[PDB]
Design a protein around this ligand. Structure first.
Ligand code: NA
Ligand code: NA
Ligand code: NA
Ligand code: NA
Ligand code: NA
Ligand code: NA
Ligand code: NA
Ligand code: NA
Lengths: 380, 380, 380, 380
């Protein structure tokens, strides 16, 4: 059973009752009990459990080789639920360039509840060892990160977390379960913004979490039931549907990524290119060892803000919009759209130059995507 | 513009673009920008704002005579967002019989983040004054409460909160905006489990929050955007649709409540009856002064567990299930279904006797509901 | 079991499998077979049967006291399926002012297939007897009709159809199953544009058909399966949901209809008023004998086109739009919007004057609807 | 702009108003008019036109290089609408093995309306010329057909229809617009059961029609508006969403088809194999000239009914169910499931042997699909 087959037949996404080959949408809040406390099929109140949500939870658990899945109303709701495993006075280590919304949730919400946050350059895992405090309880890493696609060694991070008694978490959004499986590498919890590649069609906001740890799963179920950031049934259905084509979409994206990077590296109007497939990229070898494919997110430098805006206007098949992982190729300028509150000198210092462009490669024809971006770069 | 008209024409629930007389369902995660940072209609990412969610938020703000509305993935997500207005070391006063999920969220989740919780018998508002600590920052009250329907003076609670610098919150689920408007009485924040009467059809899990305070609204928007417990667009649509009939449903429920209470008070197999419309009920006068109708939740005592189970089996039109506010009349036994973890002696002490039955009156014919419950009581 | 109870508990609208108190939405096209030809629950292909569609079909059959229900993609699809019971050379009698879309389907589509159409003033049922040809096979009547609300004797029409071997059909859209049940009066087939009152929320286009005749049901199932105008599962779900409040909505509409008619009859800027509740209305006695309530459609004359347009602009709570049976009160001018292709002299002859206004009364507050229309009429 | 790009960016599938990158779902029946007859965006009643339906209609018109698209409640509703272009006494030529539902609609429904049907072996187009009567008005062909995948020359059929004044129609379901474009070859009307490959996820029943002929489009719009077999907005949305991955899905299906056919041709338990890619298949050259890929439907003979049933039970990744074009590979036995009413001698004569198996290849991993079917065949 290869990956493309598991996407179709893994998890429980049919109706045992009627035989319907797709998961029914249980647009319902509560369930008849035949006797007090006797549930016909284990359902009693949809916040606690809903059969359509249970379907998408079984899918993500199967795809990540876990035991328990959890579906949340957004990626950041999944992150907040996982952070809530901790208590006031606990410390969490994160990669220093973690997603802006993650950094914001931790530094502007959870620090008010006494969670301490240290961000660390995890591209060298001994940086994690140094940052571990007596109060550290969690290690949270994305790999590759946004927008410069820094790679962190997942297996080494798992071993460090195990040795020091930490809950290890990987935000696996950019790679998806099709290419990278952190639970197989010893990580405790894997999570996703399903808003991106998993849904795949820019039409669901959702978060997904998987684990093989029965005790962490019990704690996550309790947090989900008590703080209530649950995914609804229609969105759960669209997630299950979108995941069916995950393998085909990711493979098309990867073919285009390879050709687009060739073009960018050869083009005179492009300076540095950031992507883990590039052999001079930091921890390229580490990425190849923990993943069998690539994210569709690429960043590259043109000269300045004026060039970046002109590039966007000159393209036919790159769409200016937020998010990533659509069927459409998306284009953005981090310095103006996601890092604009950071002072310009600090942006430059971090590599977020005025001309840094981020593209999220979609499923359009590969030659069209290469040719379109090249001709637009030619106008610079 | 009387209440039934406001339910139809209040808020923005049409499409300015096409003229569609219902709110379009924006099953979408992101939005084209014509230039970087220029949003066509103010939308850029659905977690931050979605037009269908904006519609239901405008409805609840209008119905509660507020300025800002917020839609969450569940009632307890709305509560958790409001609690997150506080910091570690802050103290919150709640009515002592607040909803089990609320008590659980505060005592098992937020206390781990250093929020201190005191529950207080708010039926005498001077009990609030005594409980105020130097660190108290929030007063959170339901009225009437579950399952014994205790009434708390909203206007007096608002004045106490204003005098002592507290954020006042009313959980207005049981009364709905059709009958009780806490913001008009000086409360800062009103919230609802829209899962119940507002949706009205047992098919959406959702929370709604309204306020007239610009600064609290800004803080709530930030929390919602950062912890991500947002309501999806399909559920937002069904909420808007369900609210259209809120007035008709509540008025039918109220006619049936009055007749059912007459029957229960006269029946020999029934002991005490709990409902704010009963003139000997504590704070009946207070309820009449802050509300112009009644909740459909009634509790009453039969002899024991055996009688309660027999009552349920003997009814034709009362459905054994969790939640309340359905179009169906629902029946439950709190001692077995919502308070079973409390020791029996403590249950008895609280009034949660083995024979305490809770009904949530639906919109069936009034004579059918009275006759059905009477004939079932006759079998005891 | 009174009507309001039957709307909640009649038909099968829960899930036997999970106990979900609402019908699951089976967004599915096909179903697993455990062995060739063995269907787990009788489903094999959604065009032939879908469980969500089966739910709404069971509702309409129960509400009309029939045995078989059928759900179509629109009211006119339900009509076309029923017309297709006939063969080339067959003749159908219809009331002379039948719905414009019905007249159009018969005279511009089915006459090309050799169905012969005679329209007849059925307010005198002996007009039907005279029109019966040797080739007549069907009698199709609406009562009350649009826009002048002509009433036809259903029971007498059923007896005539039985005596002459005709299939009798009543379009029961305007009255709904809450007020008028043609199958109980001997009619073979009853149908509805569920787009109007049954859905009730201006958000579904659908047709519903019910019958107690096993052989007609078999023929209708065959036509539905072969020409494929089936209602989808999401629309079927919204129909089931909307029907729950049918009784409450119709009763509110009826209270407002009575008061609005009082106002219109007293107002000097209004001439003739058309509604079956008016005691001088033709066949008022017949309507009272076959129905226990009223449609919310009222027509009345103001002076001219200029007055009609001014009336519409002056109202606050009457919405200019097509269709009827919304929660919003709707207003229209038939001479301009539904009868504009008829020459003006023929319109005048038929009673469709330039100043004829049609209102579809919604569920807004009764005093608001009366006061708003009166003050707008006062500006004339 | 290659095919994979056109699937993403062709047609209008964003919101001009908000910029939403997906088509909003207009769950609505009617639209505000600012003045009588003035439509804000051309919408007035959803049966006539709905913006979500308009989106999917623009997609199919673009994908088929037509000008007008039409969305129906099912494939057979699209066929029935196209047949209704004809009058009583008109004659239609169809390929002799056309889809069972098509044959049934014509011979059991439309013949009652005086449409005359001749079915003809169109694999030789001079068979069409011979069958043309003075009353012939339409030529309706599928290619390739079901279940033996007979190929008909589209371009020659178009020329014959033009010379003899016939409306030419191609049912393009099996090939999809990704591989075969009949309008480009001179055909007047192309239609699809979107229930199959276009939706692609076994969760929508729908039909789609496209044409470049303004006058035929006007007649189809009239028929659609009058007989009302329209696709709803939720199903229209899911169609637009499913079509995005059409190219990726079809290409994966085609890789698997090629390898599966190699295996079947080499296996001793398999006799004849039917698929247009096989070079000895009748009109293989014709197929290559009018299409640039293949259908995923393959039929092959095993020995008998017992072997066919054993094959099905022995597979892990082939699902026994009706329909085709799912993401799952589907398996069926025509003699038992689609041709069982035909007498056995006539079935054998037609090639529909007891051991004829039909598979619809899905998007599972190619090696898994080959290996699974081979090991199951090995058990025979
Ligand atoms: Na599965
Ligand atoms: Na582990
Ligand atoms: Na409004
Ligand atoms: Na205030
Ligand atoms: Na029922
Ligand atoms: Na009868
Ligand atoms: Na486009
Ligand atoms: Na042409």
């Amino acid at each position: 059973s290869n990956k493309k087959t598991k996407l179709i037949h893994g998890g429980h996404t049919t109706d045992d009752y009627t035989g319907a080959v797709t998961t029914p949408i249980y647009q319902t809040s509560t369930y008849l009990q035949d006797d007090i406390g006797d549930l016909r099929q284990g359902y009693e109140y949809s916040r606690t459990a809903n059969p359509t949500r249970s379907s998408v939870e079984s899918v993500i658990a199967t795809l990540e080789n876990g035991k328990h899945g959890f579906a949340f109303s957004s990626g950041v709701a999944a992150i907040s639920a996982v952070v809530m495993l901790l208590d006031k006075g606990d410390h969490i280590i994160l990669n220093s360039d973690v997603y802006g919304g993650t950094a914001r949730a931790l530094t502007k919400v959870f620090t008010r509840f006494g969670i301490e946050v240290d961000f660390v350059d995890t591209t060298h895992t001994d940086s994690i060892v140094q940052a571990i405090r007596p109060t550290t309880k969690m290690l949270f890493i994305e790999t590759p990160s946004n927008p410069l696609l820094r790679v962190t060694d997942i297996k080494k991070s798992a071993e460090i977390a195990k040795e020091h008694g930490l809950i290890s978490v990987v935000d696996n959004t950019f790679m998806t379960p099709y290419y990278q499986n952190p639970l197989d590498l010893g990580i405790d919890i894997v999570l996703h913004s399903a808003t991106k590649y998993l849904g795949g069609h820019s039409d669901v906001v959702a978060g997904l979490v998987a684990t093989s740890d029965d005790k962490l799963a019990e704690r996550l179920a309790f947090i989900s039931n008590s703080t209530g950031g649950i995914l609804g049934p229609q969105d759960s259905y669209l997630l299950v549907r979108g995941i069916k084509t995950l393998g085909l979409r990711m493979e098309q994206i990867n073919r285009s990524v390879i050709e687009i990077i060739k073009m960018l590296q050869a083009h005179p109007a492009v300076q540095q290119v950031f992507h883990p497939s590039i052999e001079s990229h930091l921890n390229h070898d580490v990425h190849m060892a923990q993943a069998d494919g690539h994210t569709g997110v690429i960043a590259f430098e043109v000269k300045n803000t004026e060039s970046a805006k002109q590039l966007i206007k000159a393209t036919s098949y790159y769409t200016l919009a937020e998010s990533l992982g659509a069927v459409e190729s998306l284009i953005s300028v981090p310095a103006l759209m996601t890092h604009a509150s950071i002072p310009a000198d600090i942006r430059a210092k971090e590599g977020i130059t005025d001309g840094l462009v981020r593209i999220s490669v979609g499923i359009e024809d590969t030659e069209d995507l290469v040719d379109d971006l090249k001709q637009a770069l030619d106008t610079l």
